[PDB]
């Protein structure tokens, strides 16, 4: 999952 | 954001002099999470007071449960002292057994  | 803590002081069971109980201090609705909480016995801090693991609600604000065993007597006065960046001075809420 990609970070903010 | 900054949310001042909501404080509630109370006993697990309806208090009864001479009968072992539990003194609770529920601090909640606060943010950020660094917070100071003490329980008082006749104005004095009580050693070894246990408390819950940090948590938070739907609205993102934090809450903790502070407690300690005690046996309520006629004249013993209890209270909860709470300090948080939103307060200019520690907030003291007295335990009213017959709320």
């Amino acid at each position: 999952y990609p970070a903010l | 954001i900054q949310r001042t803590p909501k404080i509630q002081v109370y006993s697990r069971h309806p208090a009864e002099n001479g009968k072992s109980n539990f003194l609770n201090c529920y601090v909640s609705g606060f943010h950020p999470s660094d917070i100071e909480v003490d329980l008082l016995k006749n104005g004095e801090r009580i050693e070894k007071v246990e408390h819950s693991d940090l948590s938070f609600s739907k609205d993102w604000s934090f809450y903790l449960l502070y407690y300690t065993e005690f046996t309520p007597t006629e004249k013993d006065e209890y209270a909860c002292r709470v300090n948080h960046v939103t307060l200019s001075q520690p907030k003291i809420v007295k335990w009213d057994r017959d709320m």
Binding site: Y1, A3, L4 | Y10, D34, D53, S55, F56, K58
Partner: protein
């Protein structure tokens, strides 16, 4: 039913120590059953509820590894957030996440759940469609457009729609004696002077579970909304919860007021007056 599982993750960055504090807590039907704190002895997820003890070493290790993964995820997100908001350095910030799933009485999925917050305010959240995002503000639009390009949604949905439900099932079967129980509320009313010709009436509900409950004051057959204080349901300290509802009543007319308690475990609502 309903039923739910939720993981509440908090990360607080501290000055001088470029490693954020990461705290994750898991709940089932709102009861804590697992927890991980990076400020612990040897960070690792730990059983919070008895029915979690039957989990073997493999369960913990895997769970703990993910936590090590989230510490990282939260470390970078914080750093990125710090920028989006043109914030300084050496300060303290909070990033929080809520994730989970709900089920109806039938145990099928009712809703997927995923949402984030920064500094105590909504940041970005997955929509109930588990395909679109709602960004609280400007900066969140950056994360939004950034997450739409990579298709983050589909993955979360995969989890929330499947894995989440599966794990919830197991937890539900393992501790059903604990979770599926209901403790009916015990009620009573207290009296307290408020003003010259004004009185305070307090309705109590104690030892109930789950925490959900409804308290009302009524005149004849209509509920009272004015000068009626409702306090936040609180934990008894032993798994049960407490709450009360107060209303300011004219001195001498108390008898025409009634309290009512509605709760899952009650055959029928509790109705009582002052005495």
């Amino acid at each position: 039913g309903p039923h739910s599982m939720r993981y509440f993750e908090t990360a607080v960055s501290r000055p001088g120590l470029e490693e954020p504090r990461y705290i994750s807590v898991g709940y089932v039907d709102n009861k804590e059953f697992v927890r991980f704190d990076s400020d612990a002895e040897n960070p690792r997820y730990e059983p919070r509820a008895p029915w979690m003890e039957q989990e073997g070493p493999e369960y913990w290790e895997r769970e703990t590894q993910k936590a090590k993964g989230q510490e990282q995820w939260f470390r970078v997100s914080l750093r990125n957030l710090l920028g989006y908001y043109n914030q300084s350095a050496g300060g303290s910030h909070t990033l929080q996440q809520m994730s989970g799933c709900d089920l109806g009485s039938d145990w099928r999925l009712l809703r997927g759940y995923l949402q984030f917050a920064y500094e105590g305010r909504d940041y970005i959240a997955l929509n109930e469609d588990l395909k679109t995002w709602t960004a609280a503000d400007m900066a969140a639009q950056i994360t939004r457009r950034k997450w739409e390009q990579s298709g983050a949604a589909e993955h979360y949905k995969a989890y929330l729609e499947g894995e989440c439900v599966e794990w919830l099932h197991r937890y539900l079967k393992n501790g059903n004696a604990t979770l599926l129980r209901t403790d009916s509320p015990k009620a009573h009313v207290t009296h307290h002077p408020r003003s010259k010709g004004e009185v305070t009436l307090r309705c109590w509900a104690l030892g109930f579970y789950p925490a959900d409950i409804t308290l009302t004051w009524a005149l004849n057959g209509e509920e009272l909304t004015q000068d009626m204080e409702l306090v936040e349901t609180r934990p008894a300290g032993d798994g049960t919860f407490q709450k009360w509802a107060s209303v300011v009543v004219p001195l001498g007319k108390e008898q025409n007021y009634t309290c009512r308690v509605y709760h899952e475990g009650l055959p029928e609502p509790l109705t009582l007056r002052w005495e």
